[PDB]
């Protein structure tokens with residue numbers, strides 16, 4: 177298990193998301209689905225000139241898996257996934273510069289719902305999750321598990337869990353007062369409100 181410190185600016189971003197009074201938390205789902213859509217666009221584009229890029233799985237889709245017993249909401253995609261290096265380097269985001277631009281915008285009237293315009297929408301997971309686990313598999317690397325409960329550090333380990341072929345799995349260990357995001361009608365509502373034009377099937381699993 178390797179432990180890393182977040183860059184000062186990323187720890188600042190996470191503290192802002194955790195500590196700012198902001199009721200519109202439901203946008204975390206749109207943000208994570210948007211990242212899933214971007215990763216699926218990436219593998220689809222590569223496959224247009226190289227069909228073997230899909231040897232690790234042809235289906236391009238998103239699964240939403242609530243689990244009331246574990247108090248987890250899992251978002252699975254069959255996108256391009258990430259290398260260990262990209263996972264350590266702020267989960268493939270330009271988080272340092274993105275955070276700076278987002279901070280300036282917040283002082284210029286913007287609100288947390290606009291986080292995605294600054295390329296750091298992944299970190300909106302901390303509006304609803306006390307801990308986030310990211311399992312990822314890229315065609316050019318092994319399967320890795322990234323994890324953080326914020327507090328300035330994250331861990332990276334080789335994943336021993338279920339192999340996923342190719343893509344990214346975001347496991348949201350929800351805060352006790354955020355369990356509405358495990359309810360079928362609530363998830364359906366949010367998907368319809370903010371992710372209705374996503375170009376990949378979104379399957380909402382039942383329990």
Ligand SMILES: COc1ccc(-c2c(-c3ccc(O)cc3O)n[nH]c2C)cc1
Pocket residue numbers: 208209210211212213214215216218253255256257258267268269295296297298343344346
């Ligand atoms: C906007 O920046 C980014 C940065 C990285 C990605 C990304 C993800 C991913 C990352 C997070 C996630 O929730 C789901 C995913 O498939 N997987 N692979 C890539 C290249 C997507 C958007």
